[PDB]
Design a protein around this ligand. Sequence first.
Ligand code: TAC
Ligand code: K
Ligand code: K
Ligand code: K
Ligand code: K
Ligand code: K
Ligand code: K
Ligand code: K
Ligand code: MG
Ligand code: MG
Ligand code: MG
Ligand code: MG
Ligand code: MG
Ligand code: MG
Ligand code: MG
Ligand code: MG
Ligand code: MG
Ligand code: MG
Ligand code: MG
Ligand code: MG
Ligand code: MG
Ligand code: MG
Ligand code: MG
Ligand code: MG
Ligand code: MG
Ligand code: MG
Ligand code: MG
Ligand code: MG
Ligand code: MG
Ligand code: MG
Ligand code: MG
Ligand code: MG
Ligand code: MG
Ligand code: MG
Ligand code: MG
Ligand code: MG
Lengths: 114, 200, 154, 129, 79
Amino acid sequence: ATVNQLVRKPRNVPALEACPQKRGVCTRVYTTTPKKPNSALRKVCRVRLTNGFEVTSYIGGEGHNLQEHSVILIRGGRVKDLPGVRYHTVRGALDCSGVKDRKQARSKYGVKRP
Amino acid sequence: ARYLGPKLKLSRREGTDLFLKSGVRAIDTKCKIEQAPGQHGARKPRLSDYGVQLREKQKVRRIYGVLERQFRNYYKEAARLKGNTGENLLALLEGRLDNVVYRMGFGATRAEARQLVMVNGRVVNIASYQVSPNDVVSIREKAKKQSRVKAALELAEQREKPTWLEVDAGKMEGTFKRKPERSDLSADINEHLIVELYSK
Amino acid sequence: LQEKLIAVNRVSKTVKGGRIFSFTALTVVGDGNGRVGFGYGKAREVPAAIQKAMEKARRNMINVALNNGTLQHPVKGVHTGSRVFMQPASEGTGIIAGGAMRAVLEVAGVHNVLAKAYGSTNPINVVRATIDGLENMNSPEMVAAKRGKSVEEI
Amino acid sequence: SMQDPIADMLTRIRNGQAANKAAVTMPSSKLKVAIANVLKEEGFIEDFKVEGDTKPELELTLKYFQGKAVVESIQRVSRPGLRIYKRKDELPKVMAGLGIAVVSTSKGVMTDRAARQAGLGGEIICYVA
Amino acid sequence: ELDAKLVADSITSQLERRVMFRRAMKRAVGIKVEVSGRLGGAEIARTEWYREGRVPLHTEAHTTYGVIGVKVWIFKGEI
RNA sequence: CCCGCAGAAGAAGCACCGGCUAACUCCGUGCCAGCAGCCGCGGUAAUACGGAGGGUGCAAGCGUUAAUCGGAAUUACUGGGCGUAAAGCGCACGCAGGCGGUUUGUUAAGUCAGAUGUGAAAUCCCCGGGCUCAACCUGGGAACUGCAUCUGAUACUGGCAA
RNA sequence: GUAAACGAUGUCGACUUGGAGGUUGUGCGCGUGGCUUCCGGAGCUAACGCGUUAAGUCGACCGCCUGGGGAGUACGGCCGCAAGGUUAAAACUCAAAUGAAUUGACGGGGGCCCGCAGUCGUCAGCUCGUGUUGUGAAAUGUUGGGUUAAGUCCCGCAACGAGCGCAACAUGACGUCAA
Ligand SMILES: CN(C)[C@@H]1C(O)=C(C(N)=O)C(=O)[C@@]2(O)C(O)=C3C(=O)c4c(O)cccc4[C@@](C)(O)[C@H]3C[C@@H]12
Ligand SMILES: [K+]
Ligand SMILES: [K+]
Ligand SMILES: [K+]
Ligand SMILES: [K+]
Ligand SMILES: [K+]
Ligand SMILES: [K+]
Ligand SMILES: [K+]
Ligand SMILES: [Mg+2]
Ligand SMILES: [Mg+2]
Ligand SMILES: [Mg+2]
Ligand SMILES: [Mg+2]
Ligand SMILES: [Mg+2]
Ligand SMILES: [Mg+2]
Ligand SMILES: [Mg+2]
Ligand SMILES: [Mg+2]
Ligand SMILES: [Mg+2]
Ligand SMILES: [Mg+2]
Ligand SMILES: [Mg+2]
Ligand SMILES: [Mg+2]
Ligand SMILES: [Mg+2]
Ligand SMILES: [Mg+2]
Ligand SMILES: [Mg+2]
Ligand SMILES: [Mg+2]
Ligand SMILES: [Mg+2]
Ligand SMILES: [Mg+2]
Ligand SMILES: [Mg+2]
Ligand SMILES: [Mg+2]
Ligand SMILES: [Mg+2]
Ligand SMILES: [Mg+2]
Ligand SMILES: [Mg+2]
Ligand SMILES: [Mg+2]
Ligand SMILES: [Mg+2]
Ligand SMILES: [Mg+2]
Ligand SMILES: [Mg+2]
Ligand SMILES: [Mg+2]
């Protein structure tokens, strides 16, 4: 572009609303299949946030305690093999329990020190 | 805020004597200086360019017991100061007072010397104090009945005592006369690797 | 001569039976005093490829007119998609360059330099760009010579 | 149309050197002669001469050292589409001082070194090395 | 060091003593040497070989990972 | 802040260890359970999942998430492109606009030089000083790249005249 | 009012080795203009290629691009009798999409040959060293003119040699099918 042209004319987590976490209520809790090449029953949940956005959130770790009308804290973080799953649930915050019988990376799964 | 762990492993991981032991007996008799620590110790893979730069930085740190936050602040100071950054960095570490208590021979180790923690006749209990040219460093009178300081000086009397300082007997004092040049220190530290690592 | 291995890459050609894997090795050699060459070797095994690269590097060395282990002036080098910039630096700066440029500059005997690789950072072309940059760098004497002046006049 | 005679002069030199021409000729002007004088005095060209009166032609004798052309690079800086002026303190160094910048000052066309010693800024005509 | 049986035994016993198979094979190397099996304790078993000079043919290490076969050909002149 | 008392006594965790990236083994599981920043890992010998042993990095913190700049020359003024990768209007005429061959004179708008005024203090930076050190506090300087005015220069650009 | 409206190459000007044509003027076989086609040098280019009709070296001004999709779509405006054109987004979704070139394989592509037309197959192949070419994957050698049952042999050739096969004295090359 020429100088004269430039003179004339110069040169993933939206539901958080630039907050580190948002609280929400589980409107559905289910499993879903990952895309190829993966195979599992991945534990997700639809969540209506305190700002009115409804989003799918991932429930990480081995075994969870969430129903419909469970109150959870979500954070950012997509799940690569579930298209349109852009958030993770924080384990050991609010209703969502710590992962049972974890001993490594305990602080990532809300598990108090044995 | 202190490494209070097994000390020989550091020299083993670095694969060189870091002068971290008292010297009641030989380093070879104490540990395997050839071998890196742990179950996979006799193994020695290729180390990356990053890995080399890291191990040089961790060498210069682990001698003095300076943790990363404080070491980073020395780098920043060395880069700020006029002239050669790598030389400025070593000069700053050599300028520390807690080297001096050990180096003059009052502690058997720097860890001991640090447990024991006067400059220009004023008490200073700070390991990180930068001692200046023409400053007299010295010991108190109240703790000259400790057997530690007696033993430590006999350990110190077998080493090559430093060649820009003046340790004395009895009243137990010495002048930081000048800052050391790079010629004074070991041609073994490749301090350009530390400069490069923090430039990254 | 100091010798440095910059990159090893597994390459492949297809045949009736399947794939034939082989290795390539990019190396630089230098005297640490303004002499540097690169070599590129290919073989079915990694150590053979490196040996071929090092032999090539030793015979294809060029001379660089250094100044105190830094450059004479800012230089640009280009090869294929790789465009490199290198600038003289003060003592104690070190080699502020990426790995491919760093290996070249180190064996050449450049201790102090500020560099940046633009465009493709493909090692094979970055090394050629770097050596291209160094070999066309002018000293004050040759500038004085070509212009028909004294060095103090330059 | 022809809108930068100085860029044209620089290009004639650049292309002449690349083609191993002994000399290059062009339509003369007072500013071209002033620049040619600087190139001669700094030893980039061997000689120049103006011939004519109504339509004067400037001839520049190019110089080669060891086969290679002596003008290794020559680039227009200030140009009709974007004029470039520098104060005395901000005068450019070409090739860390080994090249020249030609500067039009209120005391005539001269090198950056001569401008800096005279305490003058001006228009940066071109870089030569 | 030359006798084909001793060199075959030298390879197999070295593979039992955790010598890298290419080191044993290249040291053995008219000669050809093939070694085939779970080499380096690979899950995929592979064959490898090295020749030097002429081997005109027309003219077992009991490791932890399982059986690794070794074969040696030496052409030490005609007749 | 100092002196005295008692006794190692009252005081170490967090993340990570497939590559990128510093750090590897065994056991459990068997495309499941699960991991994942990106590529990917898991279908019976998994350094990638979970535990353990060992190790690496940080340390009264350590991780995670959010957010900004960087790397990104990936909006390119410095500093990029457009035959085929994204990119030349289907072609032309043409107002505004941008640009303008060559000589002399003049002007002094641009430009350049100097001076003066201003550009709060703090902050940043430099040399010092003070708290045992540090953070922090602080003396003087430098800087504030700017703006305005006045006095000059006249090569180049512009205006005017020929 | 749109086309692969294409040279997929904006307009104007200057400069920078050659060769062979076409077409159309003009001066004395030899010049000198205009337009145009093919090859190629430096240089340029990711490569393919471009190469004085530049994609080279520069200057002036304009138009346009900013991952693949969603989409040249929606909404709004303007234009149109209509068909529609023109201006022109977003949410959302993926970690690619793409260009050129390389080795194979494949073609209801071409040429030239062969066979009663464990395995492929006793098919005549398969490779390496060094050198050279290419930024590189790679290439060359091994292709080509002949000839042979045969990479058999001869002759040429940026290749020079060598190995395993062929042959010679049943013999199954490197490999393929997780057979
Ligand atoms: C704010 N600004 C003026 C925006 C703009 O710059 C536009 C552009 N093409 O550049 C619009 O189209 C913009 O002006 C514009 O018109 C927009 C829209 O029409 C819509 C509609 O109609 C429906 C959903 C979303 C949009 C939207 C987000 O694309 C709007 C963006 C507008
Ligand atoms: K999978
Ligand atoms: K630009
Ligand atoms: K004027
Ligand atoms: K090519
Ligand atoms: K236009
Ligand atoms: K998108
Ligand atoms: K070859
Ligand atoms: Mg702290
Ligand atoms: Mg080459
Ligand atoms: Mg790129
Ligand atoms: Mg590692
Ligand atoms: Mg297992
Ligand atoms: Mg971020
Ligand atoms: Mg940027
Ligand atoms: Mg681009
Ligand atoms: Mg296309
Ligand atoms: Mg296109
Ligand atoms: Mg067009
Ligand atoms: Mg027009
Ligand atoms: Mg003009
Ligand atoms: Mg003025
Ligand atoms: Mg201020
Ligand atoms: Mg004028
Ligand atoms: Mg169209
Ligand atoms: Mg047409
Ligand atoms: Mg056509
Ligand atoms: Mg088009
Ligand atoms: Mg026509
Ligand atoms: Mg051509
Ligand atoms: Mg439409
Ligand atoms: Mg419309
Ligand atoms: Mg073949
Ligand atoms: Mg043969
Ligand atoms: Mg031949
Ligand atoms: Mg036979």
